């Protein structure tokens, strides 16, 4: 996008991505457009700022129906951080984005078994319940979590 309908430095792109991160904007197309270029052409420039961008771009690409970039980002994140719990959550989200709910449920149950005081797994299970139209079960589980 640099010298392509716009004239901005990599710092400007980083600041725009950070601002889009602070307020929960869900414009997936623009986020993907900026993020793929930032990952490709300026990977070495960002010392330690690329992991949060990886996560954001993976989520946006999953929202945009483009799974190759999501798989690439997930592979990079898994290689960098072995055995982390956020990467497992991202893998579960990728699984459930392809209508494979049993694997995501077992993954989240494994996460909860490893760490009982985790919050994101319960929220993702509630999201899985909501995705199938089961409103009453989702409301009950959210009430229990609250």
């Amino acid at each position: 996008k640099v010298s392509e309908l716009y004239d901005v430095t990599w710092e400007e792109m980083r600041d725009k991505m950070r601002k889009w991160r602070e307020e929960n904007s869900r414009n997936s197309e623009q986020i993907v457009e900026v993020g793929e270029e930032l990952i490709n052409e300026y990977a070495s420039k960002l010392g330690d700022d690329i992991w949060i961008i990886y996560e954001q771009v993976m989520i946006a690409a999953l929202d945009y129906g483009r799974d190759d970039l999501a798989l690439f980002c997930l592979q990079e994140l898994r290689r960098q951080f072995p055995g982390s719990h956020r990467v497992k959550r991202l893998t579960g989200m990728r699984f459930e984005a392809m209508e494979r709910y049993d694997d995501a449920i077992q993954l989240y149950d494994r996460i909860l078994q490893e760490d009982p005081t985790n919050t994101a797994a319960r929220k993702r299970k509630i999201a899985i319940r909501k995705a199938q139209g089961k409103n009453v079960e989702a409301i009950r589980e959210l009430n229990e979590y609250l």
Partner: protein, 48 residues
């Protein structure tokens, strides 16, 4: 010549420059290594 008060005015003739340089370099190296280790630990703790 005599010094009644152990010559408090002139630096001693047995000063070890090499030890001073070595300890300074070691302090700098330890500072750098500890900074790197602390930064990596914070980054790894942030990402669980």
């Amino acid at each position: 010549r005599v010094y009644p008060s152990k010559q408090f005015d002139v630096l001693k003739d047995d000063y070890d420059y090499v030890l001073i340089s070595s300890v300074l370099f070691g302090l700098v190296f330890a500072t750098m290594i500890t900074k790197r280790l602390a930064q990596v630990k914070l980054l790894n703790r942030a990402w669980r």
